[PDB]
Amino acid sequence: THVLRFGGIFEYVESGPMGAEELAFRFAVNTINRNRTLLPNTTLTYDTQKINLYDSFEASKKACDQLSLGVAAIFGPSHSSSANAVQSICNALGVPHIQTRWKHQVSDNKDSFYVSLYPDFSSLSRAILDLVQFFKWKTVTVVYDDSTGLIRLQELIKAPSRYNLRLKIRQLPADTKDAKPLLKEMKRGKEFHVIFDCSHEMAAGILKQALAMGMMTEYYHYIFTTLDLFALDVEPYRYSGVNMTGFRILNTENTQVSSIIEKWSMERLQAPPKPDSGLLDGFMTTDAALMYDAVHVVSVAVQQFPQMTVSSLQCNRHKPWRFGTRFMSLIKEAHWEGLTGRITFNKTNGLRTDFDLDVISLKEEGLEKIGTWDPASGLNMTESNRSLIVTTILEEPYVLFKKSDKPLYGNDRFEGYCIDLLRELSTILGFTYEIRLVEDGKYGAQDDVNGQWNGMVRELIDHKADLAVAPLTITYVREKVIDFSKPFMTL
Amino acid sequence: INLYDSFEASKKACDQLSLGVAAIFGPSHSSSANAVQSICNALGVPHIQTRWKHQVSDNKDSFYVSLYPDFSSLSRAILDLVQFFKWKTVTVVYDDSTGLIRLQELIKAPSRYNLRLKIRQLPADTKDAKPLLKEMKRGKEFHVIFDCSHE
Ligand SMILES: O=C(O)[C@@H]1C[C@H]2C[C@@H](CN3CC(F)(F)C[C@H]3C(=O)O)CC[C@H]2CN1
């Protein structure tokens, strides 16, 4: 029947195997072909070209070859310089360029033949800040890997002048093994609240260093910028009590999406996994779920343009593709439920600025969902006969252990003036109670350096006790922090 | 060539390499300059740059030099000057993303030295800048670094 060809350009170092992106591309095409609801009468074909990383010259040549073979779109390469070069070519010949990865948008750049399936930085930036504010952090250390990290967090970096966040900015070194000296400074600095802006492979690496450093405990809370957080081996850390929170755009809760991610692991996990990585083997990363979603969203557009056919275009000549303008318009208007949730582009710039994120945190069970985020709602986090606990302290003759012939259990082990008072109060006011001897053997004073209380006063402040029944002197400093009865003895 | 047309920059660079040239004083702006640099690298003709663009570490091109004073050094000299004026408070105002990068040395200082610092962004047009300046005024931000073009 009817046939349409897509182009693919995938970046790599050394040689095979195939990478995640080129794999998801092929996988999406094979799947769609077999779907009888999507492109029923249409059968997708493709040319794939492999190039070196950062060789924009080679990327240009391969894109020109593909436009010569004839293609309806180029799922151009990932990295900034090659991607900008294929985008300029695609714009001159009016063939849609489909991107899956963020690159810096220059304002005065007029290219219009591209869409990008990657969740725009502006929106992610805001959702980081939204999360920080929900945890009520007033202090936070942002740690980034390379320059462009800065740009992904600009919304956050500019907050300290509107809201009340003091914030320290540090940079990782090239290698995470070099990161102890940096972590030691944060430790001395008491920087317990930390955002890591970096790849998920960097994050796996920096966590190991953080463990070594005594920094994976209940005292530390780490927010992760990476969307591939869910790919991290979390077995070394879930028992420790650290808090790890981040985001996930891969819609794993949907059953249809889980089954697709599985069939992927079978053809992929079948090939090289690593031991010392700290990543789960055969998890579908975001770079690849996006490519697979891009092939679908573009196909939804092809369904609405049966007239369209490929033309052999030459980079030599300034003659664009007849159907380009109309196809590009259909793609930008397209809507699709894919591996990464609602797909919808921005009328204005063709960037994916509106999308849905699950919000995930480390519980002892593993990484689990604790809410959602979307740009229009912010966070949607999904959150009398009692005995009184009486704190007291041994002090003659107020509270002592009773000497008795009879067996004594529980509260009846104690006697004294304060015990007699407690018994009367419990009868008059009608409560039951449990007597507990205070853990530090103190009445209650405030530390002159850190301002923390101890003794029975601290038990009350922290609501660990209901009552302190003891010869607790009523003083100015104490009455400011607890509520005393009127005195039962004056002296 | 047009600004930001890396495709046209590629074509013109190829024409020139065809005429024969000992070096291309390639174009100024990031995307066209990166494209002419990749071409120049494949054909081993020196590409001479005059403007800063972001250096990617894992990029292996070797046939270029850049006459623009590197950002790392300028960053330090800004910080050196701030410290000589003994400022402990400063508001950095930048125009566009890449401004951030030129001041990274300065932005990372508040954890080593004793500088509290506030980071604000200019709007597209400076005529729109009164509301921003009013906040700085109320804020008593008397010490200010402007990272932006001379225009
Ligand atoms: O609330 C308090 O801090 C005190 C503790 C406790 C203090 C004792 C008296 N002090 C115990 C002491 F021996 F340590 C010295 C003596 C005193 O200062 O005269 C009497 C019963 C108590 C009255 N309230």
From Swiss-Prot, chain A:
This is Glutamate receptor ionotropic, kainate 2. The postsynaptic actions of Glu are mediated by a variety of receptors that are named according to their selective agonists. This receptor binds domoate > kainate > quisqualate > glutamate. It does not bind AMPA without coexpression with GRIK5. It comes from the Eukaryota. The keyword Disulfide bond applies. The keyword Transmembrane helix applies. Residues 1-491 are extracellular. It catalyses: Ca(2+)(in) = Ca(2+)(out); Na(+)(in) = Na(+)(out). Ionotropic glutamate receptor that functions as a cation-permeable ligand-gated ion channel, gated by L-glutamate and the glutamatergic agonist kainic acid. L-glutamate acts as an excitatory neurotransmitter at many synapses in the central nervous system. Binding of the excitatory neurotransmitter L-glutamate induces a conformation change, leading to the opening of the cation channel, and thereby converts the chemical signal to an electrical impulse. The receptor then desensitizes rapidly and enters a transient inactive state, characterized by the presence of bound agonist. Independent of its ionotropic glutamate receptor activity, acts as a thermoreceptor conferring sensitivity to cold temperatures. Functions in dorsal root ganglion neurons. Highest expression is found in the olfactory lobe, piriform cortex, dentate gyrus, hippocampus, granular cell layer of the cerebellum, and in caudate-putamen. GO terms for molecular function: extracellularly glutamate-gated ion channel activity; glutamate receptor activity; glutamate-gated calcium ion channel activity; glutamate-gated receptor activity; identical protein binding; kainate selective glutamate receptor activity; ligand-gated monoatomic ion channel activity involved in regulation of presynaptic membrane potential; PDZ domain binding. Coiled coil: none annotated. L-glutamate binds at P471, T473, R478. The gene is Grik2. It is found in: Cell membrane; Postsynaptic cell membrane. Homotetramer and heterotetramer with GRIK5. Tetramers may be formed by the dimerization of dimers. Assembles into a kainate-gated homomeric channel that does not bind AMPA. Can form functional heteromeric receptors with GRIK4 and GRIK5. Can form functional heteromeric receptors with GRIK3. Interacts with DLG4. Interacts with NETO2. Interacts (via C-terminus) with KLHL17 (via kelch repeats); the interaction targets GRIK2 for degradation via ubiquitin-proteasome pathway. Disulfide bonds join C64-C315. Glycans are attached at N35, N41, N243, N346, N380, N385. Belongs to the glutamate-gated ion channel (TC 1.A.10.1) family. GRIK2 subfamily. It is a multi-pass membrane protein. Cold receptor activity activated by temperatures between 10-19 degrees Celsius. GO terms for cellular component: axon; dendrite; dendrite cytoplasm; glutamatergic synapse; hippocampal mossy fiber to CA3 synapse; ionotropic glutamate receptor complex; kainate selective glutamate receptor complex; membrane. It comes from Rattus norvegicus (Rat).
